[PDB]
Amino acid sequence: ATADPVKDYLKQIGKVPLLNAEQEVELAKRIEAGLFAEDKLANSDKLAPKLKRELEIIAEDGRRAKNHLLEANLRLVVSLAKRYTGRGMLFLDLIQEGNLGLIRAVEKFDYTKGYKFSTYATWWIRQAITRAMADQARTIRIPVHMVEVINKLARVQRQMLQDLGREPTPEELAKELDMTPEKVIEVQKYGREPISLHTPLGEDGDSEFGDLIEDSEAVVPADAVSFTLLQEQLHSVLDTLSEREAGVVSMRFGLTDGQPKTLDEIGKVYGVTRERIRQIESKTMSKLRHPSRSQVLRDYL
Amino acid sequence: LRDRFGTYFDGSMGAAALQKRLESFDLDEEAERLREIIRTGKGQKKTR
Amino acid sequence: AAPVTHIWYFKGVPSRLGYLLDLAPKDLEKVIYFAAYMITFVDEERRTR
Amino acid sequence: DRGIDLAPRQAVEYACEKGHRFEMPFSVEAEIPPEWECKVCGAQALLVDGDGPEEKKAKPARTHWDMLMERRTREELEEVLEERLAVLRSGA
Amino acid sequence: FDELRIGLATADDIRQWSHGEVKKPETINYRTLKPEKDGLFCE
Amino acid sequence: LNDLYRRVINRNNRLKRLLDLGAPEIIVNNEKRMLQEAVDALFDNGRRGRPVTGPGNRPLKSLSDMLKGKQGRFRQNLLGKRVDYSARSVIVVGPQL
Numbered sequence: 001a002t003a004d005p006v007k008d009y010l011k012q013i014g015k016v017p018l019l020n021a022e023q024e025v026e027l028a029k030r031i032e033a034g035l036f037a038e039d040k041l042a043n044s045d046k047l048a049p050k051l052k053r054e055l056e057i058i059a060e061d062g063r064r065a066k067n068h069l070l071e072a073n074l075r076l077v078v079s080l081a082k083r084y085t086g087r088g089m090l091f092l093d094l095i096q097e098g099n100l101g102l103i104r105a106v107e108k109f110d111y112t113k114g115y116k117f118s119t120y121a122t123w124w125i126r127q128a129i130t131r132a133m134a135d136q137a138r139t140i141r142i143p144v145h146m147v148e149v150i151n152k153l154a155r156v157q158r159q160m161l162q163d164l165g166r167e168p169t170p171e172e173l174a175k176e177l178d179m180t181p182e183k184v185i186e187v188q189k190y191g192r193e194p195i196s197l198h199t200p201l202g203e204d205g206d207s208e209f210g211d212l213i214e215d216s217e218a219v220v221p222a223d224a225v226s227f228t229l230l231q232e233q234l235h236s237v238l239d240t241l242s243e244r245e246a247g248v249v250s251m252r253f254g255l256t257d258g259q260p261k262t263l264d265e266i267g268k269v270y271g272v273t274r275e276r277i278r279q280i281e282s283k284t285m286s287k288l289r290h291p292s293r294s295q296v297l298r299d300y301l
Numbered sequence: 302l303r304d305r306f307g308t309y310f311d312g313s314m315g316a317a318a319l320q321k322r323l324e325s326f327d328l329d330e331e332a333e334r335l336r337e338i339i340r341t342g343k344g345q346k347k348t349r
Numbered sequence: 350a351a352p353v354t355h356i357w358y359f360k361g362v363p364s365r366l367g368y369l370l371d372l373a374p375k376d377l378e379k380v381i382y383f384a385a386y387m388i389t390f391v392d393e394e395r396r397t398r
Numbered sequence: 399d400r401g402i403d404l405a406p407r408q409a410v411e412y413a414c415e416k417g418h419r420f421e422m423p424f425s426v427e428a429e430i431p432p433e434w435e436c437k438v439c440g441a442q443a444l445l446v447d448g449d450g451p452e453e454k455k456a457k458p459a460r461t462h463w464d465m466l467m468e469r470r471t472r473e474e475l476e477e478v479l480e481e482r483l484a485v486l487r488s489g490a
Numbered sequence: 491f492d493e494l495r496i497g498l499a500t501a502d503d504i505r506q507w508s509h510g511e512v513k514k515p516e517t518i519n520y521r522t523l524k525p526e527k528d529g530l531f532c533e
Numbered sequence: 534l535n536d537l538y539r540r541v542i543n544r545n546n547r548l549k550r551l552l553d554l555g556a557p558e559i560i561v562n563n564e565k566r567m568l569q570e571a572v573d574a575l576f577d578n579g580r581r582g583r584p585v586t587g588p589g590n591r592p593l594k595s596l597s598d599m600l601k602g603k604q605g606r607f608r609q610n611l612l613g614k615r616v617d618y619s620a621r622s623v624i625v626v627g628p629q630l
Contacts, residue, residue, distance in 0.1 A: 356577045
């Protein structure tokens with residue numbers, strides 16, 4: 001129990017016996033035997049209790065074989081995880097995600113095909129490690145297809161840079177990737193990394209990067225004062241008009257009541273034609289459009 | 302020990318061990334024992 | 350998924366750690382960071398009987 | 399905020415499997431959902447008029463046994479297990 | 491404001507403060523720029 | 534703190550997935566130790582061992598690092614604060630005043 005827990009984990013791997021071909025295929029045979037035993041005892045058919053105990057013993061031996069293969073392959077998953085380190089995700093996280101990929105590998109391994117465990121496990125190790133890199137390395141999560149799109153674009157851009165000796169134009173990248181240039185610039189936009197709010201500017205430690213940026217959700221006192229003055233002034237200029245005109249305007253365009261009732265919806269409580277209410281509404285609009293009652297509300301926008 | 306001896310001692314590992322220890326912790330008798338050591342004690346253990 | 354300890358109380362001054370359980374700070378480090386097992390309960394009367 | 403009337407609210411009672419009971423405020427015009435997430439433990443909440451699983455299990459994840467059906471046929475399993483029983487009697 | 495208390499916070503107090511479980515490490519969506527559901531920053 | 538919380542949820546979810554299926558005790562204990570270290574670095578980054586860095590330049594700010602020191606909440610945001618209705622300019626002498 002010391003600092004840098006990756007060293008402690010590597011020592012915890014310890015001197016475990018590496019597996020050659022014969023030991024590995026013997027362990028695989030024991031794996032299949034224990035699997036068959038636990039499958040048989042999982043069935044509901046009635047057998048001998050001693051036979052069920054023997055099947056449980058074989059299942060325990062199979063589980064021990066599962067373990068022994070896993071601590072056999074911890075070294076190779078550590079190597080392939082160090083192959084993918086230093087890209088914004090910690091080493092031990094990559095090791096553990098590869099370990100999940102490796103137990104997936106041992107769940108899908110068979111002795112019928114005459115190949116070693118390493119060359120079959122490697123595909124799952126790389127797949128799980130790059131999947132966890134897609135789903136966990138970036139703070140703003142990117143789907144795996146977009147991750148492979150952006151890293152393919154990055155690698156072909158690097159190839160064109162080392163070939164042509166210059167930064168490739170986005171149009172040539174668009175033709176060589178067979179995508180539209182708008183898609184290419186969208187991909188380059190999506191391929192960013194956030195910068196921390198706690199980065200110091202320079203000599204001063206206390207002045208932070210997060211204290212140089214304002215916020216837009218903060219309510220401006222001048223805006224609230226202007227809104228309140230608008231609220232007070234609009235009622236006054238409505239009271240300047242006649243009571244009936246102010247009433248039909250306040251029943252027509254929001255104001256007192258949130259929902260604005262239409263000409264039809266107010267023609268029952270007041271009881272005239274559509275043409276009369278429309279004409280008096282147009283008259284009120286023309287009266288409010290006159291420049292006399294404008295300077296009190298023009299600058300309110 | 303686990304393969305040879307069973308259902309005699311209960312073991313754990315990590316912070317779960319501390320939680321299980323604090324489940325069965327009896328603090329008042331420990332306070333009384335520390336007070337007893339306070340009455341008769343010498344040296345740095347005294348300060349302890 | 351598994352309970353974890355608070356870093357203010359473990360790894361601190363004895364006025365803060367407290368030695369509530371009679372264990373050394375190195376002993377606490379060895380037990381909580383998964384390097385040594387801890388025997389939390391024993392049937393002492395059943396063992397002696 | 400001066401003169402605004404809130405949409406009429408009804409407090410609908412949700413109970414989970416663990417016994418936690420809680421009230422959630424919904425609108426009258428709102429459609430009441432039979433399913434909700436428990437504020438206490440995060441589990442499924444029920445006992446609101448009619449409710450059920452609605453295919454809660456939903457074809458669960460393939461264990462090792464299903465992959466065994468996928469890769470090896472039963473009678474093949476029969477002969478190899480019989481060989482495993484023979485290995486047992488050899489070791490016994 | 492008669493006084494101000496401080497003490498150890500048990501799991502019950504932490505669950506009582508909480509309005510829900512943060513079950514996902516995701517923070518915001520990369521395209522819609524809207525916070526993800528049932529994770530960090532969740533509305 | 535978003536990065537620290539994200540690491541905590543990542544390790545806790547991975548531990549949950551490991552406990553869902555059959556896993557060896559060494560892998561489970563390693564992931565539990567990673568979860569414990571993630572929680573500790575969330576509360577104090579750099580109290581034990583090398584602090585979590587991130588981009589590779591400076592230690593990752595934790596919960597307790599903004600309740601501590603000159604940059605903490607107590608001394609930079611409570612006792613001394615910016616103010617409105619305030620100004621600053623150079624001074625000149627006026628004897629007529």
